[PDB]
């Protein structure tokens with residue numbers, strides 16, 4: 001699929017919220033533990049993502065995630081569209097979080113350790129972190 | 141220079157702390173407004189950075205920035221070394237922040253807008269965001 005398509009959803013763990021972005025073409029992920037599910041936090045994450053990758057469109061599993069004017073303003077400013085109307089990651093990620101959870105005091109540390117492990121793991125046969133960079137560089 | 145060298149420093153603005161990472165070979169930046177200058181926040185940012193890019197070494201302008209065991213543990217786990225013993229960005233970035241500051245309520249929004257503007261600006265003649273991806277993909 002197109003190199004500009006992203007998936008953005010939130011999951012819950014230990015009473016906290018984890019924001020999870022997936023680059024659909026590569027399987028690369030970025031993730032953050034956020035205070036709670038707020039439009040303001042979603043908007044921040046979108047702006048950071050867009051300043052780093054060529055983000056064209058973002059899909060989500062919960063469309064109400066994007067209804068706040070803060071989110072719509074971020075998407076407007078960054079030139080991002082949404083699709084009005086991947087699972088192997090959110091499973092794998094929570095699996096990897098589980099494996100490393102006791103090795104870190106704060107969930108946020110375990111989450112970033114798990115993202116690192118996911119993006120560097122070679123499946124075949126590049127890693128997801130290698131694929132995204134190769135896909136983006138190629139499209140240039 | 142080598143594609144694995146990063147620069148990480150903190151600057152201050154409006155009573156808040158901005159963490160600024162620069163990919164030395166490309167001029168690409170990532171930045172975050174953080175509560176205050178804490179080892180814990182530095183460690184989080186390092187782990188996120190490392191899960192996304194092939195980070196080998198990080199330089200800083202304030203070596204005491206890296207003395208907390210939290211930071212040393214993050215660097216240990218991610219395989220990152222520091223150099224025991226770029227300015228055009230921190231100037232340009234605060235300049236760009238200034239230009240957009242009134243267009244956003246929170247400094248954190250202005251910071252991400254400024255990072256976006258910096259990484260997408262074409263100097264010549266790719267943008268910094270294009271250069272980093274091309275440098276990393278090539279080194280694969």
Ligand SMILES: [As]
Nearest residue numbers: 009010037065
């Ligand atoms: As969400």
Ligand SMILES: [As]
Nearest residue numbers: 075080081082
């Ligand atoms: As959007």
Ligand SMILES: [As]
Nearest residue numbers: 149150177205
């Ligand atoms: As700092």
Ligand SMILES: [As]
Nearest residue numbers: 215220221222
């Ligand atoms: As280090």
